[PDB]
Structures are given as C-alpha cells and as structure tokens.
C-alpha cells in the first residue's frame, strides 16, 4: 500500500511567483506503490490570477511513470488514490484538506506510459484555493506537505 509524502519547501517563493503571474508547475519525485509496483508522481500547479475560471487555485494531479516492474504488472492501472494537503497543527486541532478518487482504467492517464512520465494526468484542477491555505496551519516552516496514498 503505497504512501508518499511530498515535501515542498521554499513555498513562500512559489507563492510569490504566482502573485507575480509567473507560472508555477512542479512535479514530485517518482515513487513506487510497492516493489514490485507502479511508478507514479504528483504534479502541482499554482494557477495564475489571470486563469480562466480556476485562478488562484492549487491543482493536483497524479501521473503514471515508466517503472522497473511495468512488464510484470497488469495494465491499465486500477485502484484508489487519496490526495491530502496536510494540516500541520497539533492532533486535536487538525483538519487535513483531502480528496479520494478511483482510477479510471478507461482513461489514457492509467495506461502503461511510453515515455518517462505519462503526459495525461488525473486529478483536481481546483484541488484547494490559495486563500484556504490561510485558514489552518497548512504551511509550516515554509513547507507544504502533499500526501498521496494509493490502494492497489
């Protein structure tokens, strides 16, 4: 059962880029659901203030990647993916920001990739608005934590 926590430091600088209307598109390191297992990564966007309807949102997508075990694994990928922006306050006062989605084997995002990262990602264009970050302690020590849990 694959779990990866993506640590995005220097977050204030990424927010400043977004405020200055400079694109911010970043990718997590690749991580495996198991060994053997699938290789995946996360893609995060800070949508620009001038974007069409999703301005000032965090977008969060998952991508399949070419992994060492791909020849031994069934395709298309099927399973459940939980994406969470972690609330970094203490346990009694904490509420993470979370979505859970089922992979859709019919989509090209979940077929076996032919290049290092599958260009089709699957996720949330409007995962979390930037202003929602200010309501709880999501940023701590200039770091956002993005957790991805994958079932089968």
């Amino acid at each position: 059962n694959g779990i990866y926590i993506w640590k995005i430091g220097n977050f204030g600088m990424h927010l400043k880029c977004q405020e200055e209307e400079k694109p911010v598109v970043i990718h997590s390191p690749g991580f495996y659901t198991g060994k053997p297992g699938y290789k995946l990564c996360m893609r995060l966007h800070l949508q620009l203030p001038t974007a069409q309807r999703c301005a000032n949102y965090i977008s969060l997508f998952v991508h399949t990647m070419q992994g060492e075990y791909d020849s031994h694994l069934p395709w298309p990928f099927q399973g459940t993916i939980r994406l969470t922006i972690l609330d970094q306050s203490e346990a009694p006062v904490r509420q993470n920001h979370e979505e859970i989605m089922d992979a859709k084997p019919e989509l090209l995002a979940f077929q076996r990739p032919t290049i290092p990262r599958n260009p089709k990602g699957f996720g949330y264009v409007t995962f979390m608005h930037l202003e929602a970050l200010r309501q709880r302690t999501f940023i701590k020590d200039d770091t956002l934590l993005v957790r991805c849990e994958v079932s089968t």
């Binding site: 598109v25 893609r43 977008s59 997508f61 991508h63 979505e99 989605m101 989509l107 090209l108 995002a109 990262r117 260009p119 089709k120 990602g121 699957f122 996720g123 949330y124 264009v125």
Partner: peptide, 11 residues
C-alpha cells in the same frame, strides 16, 4: 469536487 484528465502539454 470531481477529478478530471488533463494533458501537461496544455492540450
């Protein structure tokens, strides 16, 4: 509230 497929090359 619902997930979608997006191409990282903007189409």
């Amino acid at each position: 509230s619902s997930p979608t497929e997006m191409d990282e090359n903007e189409s």
